[PDB]
Design an enzyme around this catalytic site. Structure first.
Site: not given
Lengths: 253, 259, 252, 251, 254, 253
Positions: E221, E78, E6, E166
């Site tokens: 938040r 990888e 990848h 959320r």
């Protein structure tokens, strides 16, 4: 009727507080025929009910069908109509090599390999039989010359893969149930059956009393199939135990 | 502690020191082993290591072990396994407990048929779906023994918790908190007809069933969490002695039945 | 003042840190390596002593075996003002490269216990406090010891949960068969029976915990430890934990 | 011969497809809508009839209530060469916009049963066969009905698993408290008690399954329905399942 | 040929690199690499953008992970195939505790495993715990730059929306298993949510690789006050400075 | 931008109700260029989006990145912008011996080996595709003379251990995943993939419509490596199916 499935009213039970609950609708009559003055009540789906008398008291015999879901309906709806004690009678296959065809098993607890039990209590809660019912069944057996095995049963939602049977359409059992038969043998489980986890768990949760006895008619570990006379005398043995247990419970109350 | 003086890792015992004992009474508190042994004939101290204090005594001419387990399934599992290696086949748990049903009073006696598995150790012996259920003959001996002494015990299900505090939904604690999974859990068990909390029977019953050993449990109620009243020391000490008398008589009838 | 330990806040004389071994017999031994050691109490498996290090009071309290008794000890000491807990033990290693006599410092635990689940859901990590772990590591390095630092498997049983077959049944059921090999392959150093409960509960309650252990046996070898080996290994590990306590006290 | 059904391969006369209602008394009613109906066997909750559609044999066999009995029925019919299974039933909806008289075709099941777990782990989907689902849908549309298509919650119980409080205990334990609302908010159409087992086992076994149901009650609604609309609903649903069998036979 | 599946990288392209800094956003790789000596672009494939640079004369890879455990698991596996043994995660994060302010720095010792990929490396009971030496290098680096970080537990979610409870969403709903979950984590002293660390820590422990995580808090938040853009960039730059210095310390020590 | 990650606004979509969602950002452009009047919209992180027209209606093509977590962001944020239908296109490996390179798979359901699906619905809820989407994809394939395999896909959060790959850095897979490939083969699962469990579960939970088609470019069970031309033609084949499927869904509206 006053219940959704059974086709029964409170009045039809004539005050019955105890039920004997076999699986097969055709067995209901045969059991009620060992009682005094038995009468047909109803037949609706897999639920065939009879009323009989033991110790001059009314007793329901109602078939449950196969599996927890149908048992849960049967038991719930009988409880709505005033039944407080439930005695399961059956015929079973053993998984221990020392248990023989013709032996009688009384179950104290069930391995919960079913789904319906989890709708009454979380998995960690024990599927355990009622003490007084279990005693009545054991005492009934020893008094009648039978030395029962008393212990744990595996209660499966399936007849085939859950009981690790390979003699089947696919010939396969997926890995979670591969080796499960041996697992239960090594944990001293006596036998497989398909109703007791639901029965015991729901009865403990609802404050109802349950017990179970079964006659062994096959052993999964053994070679030779027995003749259908030893099958029938085994079934008789089991009924004699449940009938006598019912009488003891009635006389005690 | 010398490993040369023991055939097992923790208990400090050899098979011969048990003199053929096939049955054990297993209290939680090391300090109670002696007292229970003194109910028997010719009591003798065996060993003391960590939370495991053992005595031997005789009932109906047969040797009977009394060994403390400490608190919790992990220590119970060590005690039972090592006594089983030394030939003990039957285990009778004796203790005191609080109840969670309003109809159970201080002074009542509970005999436990099955345990809610809120412990860890039981899962090392069998998967969660396997029932933590007492041996029939032990349960019957305990019940029968109680009735023969004027006591009608409640018989039923106990919740067996790996903790004393959050797992029994206590808020009277350092944090004052119980996380969501155990919030409302006391009420849950009440509604499912659980009699009481305790901290050892799930492990005990599950392991004994799995190993082919016999176990039962009796307990005296010394507090009720739904009740406002404080109980007095006299009734508490009396309840402890009551339950011991039951366990001893149960051992007697198990011994004579196996004769 | 507390349900189990037989202790009061006053008897601790201000102690904010505790050393917590398993065996009640070890409480005095550990206390004797501090200043002005004195007996506090003994009740069930909990035997407590007080001592002084850097002129600050330190409790030594035995926990007994397993999460359940550990949870009682830690909770009750926390009600009495103790904020920091240092576990010391002896242990069996499951990796071949770990030798008898080696010292292990545990960063996190595999939760094979029940009690931790009463403090947090399984997915929450049973991880040691940073400052405690560092103090233990530093103490060891300063005493000439290079400890292994890593993960410990924390089991509610001594026997099947540690995949022992030298037992009454000789059996382990399928869910724990192959489990020792599984943990070896996941780089777990050793088994123990208390740290999952300790770490999880301390993180949940805002308390500080660390663990150091001496290796007395290797599950991959045939050798079994004699008491002299146990004794010297224990002494090694006690020296580490006492010094770590000094370092935490000095830094605080 | 098989262990429970009282059937042999010869008695099925080459039947490759089965219509599987729950109620033993319903097998005949459904077989009456095919050609040359004949009783086969009645054993326990399993009452079987044979009939012909597009000149092809079709089994009708009752399953009883629940996954356990369903799993026996399907397994033993498969041993006897049945490869396709069409479930017909009557159901109760949990969405306010689904009306008594509507028809539901199920693509997938919420697995609130035990038997499905004996065939595949829980993460494996209880999903209907593509062919069967299309035939059921097409059959319905061709008869002037727009069925709702979607997910059904498949429960091992009638009472607490469907969060019913009109019971002996009047109680549902916390894990099932608020579960009806949970399924509503996840767009589940209805409760039923057999499809999780049926769909999961057939996918594991390489068999083909589908399900259609007539709506005869709605848990959210004020009213109570008369037997006129009820009888026509289940009659409507049977018509859909018969026509679906035809279509599958045809291809 | 010798290229991993990848990342579009070969072992020769890394020139001996044993250590990687792994941001999430492809567009951040270059910026972090420019904090090192002699930065060079290596490759860009899907969400994986990689650069090489040098610190204390040793080569160091910077490779972006994309969002979530699944792409992280590709990246780390990888790079390990290519000889990278040490992984330093760097990011910015929100906080869920009222006392943690924008501009603070968080070093993560352990992760709550609310992900899927971690379970492919170890059973759920196994701890998602950071490497001791990496965590020390991050903490010591931060202290040497005048920051005192919070050190603790992070909740690692496979989702941005419902798994972080959320409700400002298309559905407006969170199903019951996740209702109340934010408060549950706050009450268990969890510092923040993020989406990668459970996978990273669990896989690294399982495979014998070394991992650590630092993040700068850019939002909270639980607070009403809104931070200004300067504070945000200062926090980003600060987190980057810590991760670079930590890598230097690890390189020097080895 | 009025969504947190995609860099998109509702106006930029010009009314699009449907999206094609490949995984690789580099694929977005070429898929959109099969449509009329293709235009670049945005590129942020793994999310590269384009707009095109089919049957006179606007269609978004947006890349998801690898895995459920990035997929979940993409789909949520497009839903906030009015997209109601999501067609997944990719290439895949097969795990069944009879599935050949070049074949096309249409997925009805996914094995949930992911984490993100569990944030939308409990595990027992099925990861099942939308009926109309699946029909459109099946029909489009048949119209190109392809008989697709229709069935179950295993949706894994990892490329390596969750697909039981041993050709890795460690060369190891822990016990829970040892023998898992074989397990899924025996349960008639067609292939592994990394996004469908999340996509199907979230879409059913939010009331959105999803489907998935894929071209088989490799087979784990087969000996042969296929050549580049066979692989590139398979990509084209599958994209043609998904475009046609979208035409049908649009036309049905």
């Amino acid at each position: 009727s006053e219940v959704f499935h059974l086709g029964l009213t409170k009045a039809m039970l004539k005050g019955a507080k105890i039920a004997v609950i076999p699986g097969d609708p055709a067995r209901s009559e045969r059991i009620a025929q060992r009682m005094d003055k038995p009468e047909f009540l109803a037949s609706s789906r897999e639920f065939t009910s009879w009323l009989g008398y033991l110790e001059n008291e009314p007793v329901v015999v109602c078939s449950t069908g196969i599996g927890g879901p149908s048992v849960s309906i049967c038991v719930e709806e009988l409880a709505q109509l005033g039944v407080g004690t439930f005695l399961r009678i059956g015929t079973t296959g053993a998984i221990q090599p020392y248990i023989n065809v013709g032996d009688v098993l009384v179950t104290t607890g069930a391995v919960r390999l079913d789904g319906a039990s989890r709708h009454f209590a979380p998995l960690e809660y024990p599927a355990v039989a009622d003490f007084s019912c279990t005693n009545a069944l054991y005492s009934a057996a020893v008094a009648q010359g039978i030395t029962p095995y008393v212990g744990i049963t595996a209660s499966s939602d399936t007849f085939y893969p859950g009981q690790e049977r390979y003699d089947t359409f696919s010939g396969k059992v997926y890995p979670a149930y591969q080796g499960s038969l041996k697992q239960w043998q090594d944990l001293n489980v006596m036998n497989y059956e398909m109703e007791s986890a639901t029965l015991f768990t729901m009865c403990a949760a609802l404050g109802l009393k349950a017990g179970m006895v079964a006659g062994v008619i096959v052993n999964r570990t053994q070679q030779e199939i027995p003749n259908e006379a030893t099958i029938k005398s085994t079934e008789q043995k089991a009924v004699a135990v449940v009938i006598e247990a019912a009488r003891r419970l009635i006389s005690a109350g």
